[PDB]
Structure 1
Amino acid sequence: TAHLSQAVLTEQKETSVLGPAEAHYAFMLDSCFTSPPPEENPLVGFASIGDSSLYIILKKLLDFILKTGGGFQRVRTHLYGSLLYYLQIAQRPDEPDTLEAAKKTMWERLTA
């Protein structure tokens, strides 16, 4: 679960160099202020962050946290550590406090 989390935690960042993850920030750099182009939402391999496999792995980990009796304390610490690394796959990164992101209105922040 640590290495699954570490692999998504490179995927996110190099798809933010030569992949789809930059698109909604790269489009924010155009000098377009009246009658824009349409917008479309590509993913490719980034769609796998929505698998049934990832929801099955979450269940099977919670099922094993319940099945481990109290005295298996060293098993439970590795499973709580596993669930923290799994919940890092579900982590949003740190966004930059730009004077431009601060312009995105309460409408865009509710209709994106």
Structure 2
Amino acid sequence: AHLSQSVRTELKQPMTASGLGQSQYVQMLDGSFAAPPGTENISAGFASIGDSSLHMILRNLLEFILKTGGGFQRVRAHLYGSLLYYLQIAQRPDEPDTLESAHKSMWERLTAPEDVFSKLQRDNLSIFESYGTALMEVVCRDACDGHDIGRMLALALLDRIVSVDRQQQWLLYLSNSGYLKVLVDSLAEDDVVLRNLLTPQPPLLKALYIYESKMAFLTRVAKS
């Protein structure tokens, strides 16, 4: 959580504060006149040392999920929370939909070098793919049968993984294994509990947050 917060805090300081006062006296002695220095120094904080260390943290976090059995419901909830905070590091910041962002020609969007976040998201997805059906089975089972908080976080994790899964491998697994049908069929069980929440003095709102997480995940699947 604090790693996700520190990376997001670095990204919010704009680059105008490294240009006033004290290193300008030692580099004036290599005279080579050739070519304008005008693009290569803009991105050197987050990107040159981070990728390998983050991929190791992801692998180890996925392995720690697989080592936890069905008895460790609170541990699982923390690990799904950790994985959601990790997946938030690779998230592109919401660019404002300015009228000028549409002046960027379709040509500049096809020839722009791949953004560092899209590289990290792809490399993270290749790591999820290396754990195969074992990780898919654990997350899908905890989304259907888990404890209230575990179900919510597993559904939020599925919403996030399916949002980045361009090959639709997780969607194909969820359909072919029947978990997508179990999640849909359980809406009839939620109906009985959701009716009780409309009373002036409702029970604990846990069923509402499970329903919201389930419907958010189904809404995500419906976008393809």
**Shorter-chain TM-score tier:** 0.7 to 0.9
CA 46–18 in structure 1, closer or farther in 2 if over 3 Å, else same: farther
Q: Deviations over 1:83-111 (max 9, x none)?
A: 00000101111111111111111111110
In structure 2, C-alpha distance between the alignment counterparts of 1:68 and 1:18, rounded to whole Å: 47
Q: TM-score, normalised by structure 1?
A: 0.74
The residue number in structure 1 matching 2:87 is 87
User: Percent same amino acid at aligned positions?
Assistant: 75
Q: Name stretches of at least 5 consecutive residues in structure 2 with no aligned partner.
A: 18-35, 113-224
Give the alignment of 1:1-112 within 5 angstroms: 2-14=1-13, 16-18=14-16, 40-42=39-41, 43-48=43-48, 50-112=50-112
Q: Which amino acid aligns with 1:40?
A: T
3-state DSSP class of the match of 2:11?
helix
CA 38–106 in structure 1, closer or farther in 2 if over 3 Å, else same: farther
In structure 1, C-alpha distance between the alignment counterparts of 2:16 and 2:92, rounded to whole Å: 20
CA 4–48 in structure 1, closer or farther in 2 if over 3 Å, else same: farther
Q: Which amino acid aligns with 2:102?
A: A
CA 7–77 in structure 1, closer or farther in 2 if over 3 Å, else same: same
Larger Rg: 2
The residue number in structure 1 matching 2:155 is none
Q: Which amino acid aligns with 1:45?
A: G
Q: Which amino acid aligns with 2:57?
A: I
CA 75–88 in structure 1, closer or farther in 2 if over 3 Å, else same: same
CA 11–48 in structure 1, closer or farther in 2 if over 3 Å, else same: farther
In structure 1, C-alpha distance between the alignment counterparts of 2:49 and 2:95, rounded to whole Å: 20
TM superposition shift of 1:45: 1.6
In structure 1, C-alpha distance between the alignment counterparts of 2:61 and 2:10, rounded to whole Å: 23
Q: Deviations over 1:18-74 (max 9, x none)?
A: 37xxxxxxxxxxxxxxxxx78523322222474210000000000000000011011
Q: Which amino acid aligns with 1:84?
A: L
Q: Which amino acid aligns with 1:57?
A: I
In structure 2, C-alpha distance between the alignment counterparts of 1:69 and 1:59, rounded to whole Å: 18
Q: Deviations over 1:6-27 (max 9, x none)?
A: 000101111x2437xxxxxxxx
The residue number in structure 2 matching 1:29 is none
Aligned alpha-carbon RMSD (Å): 2.0
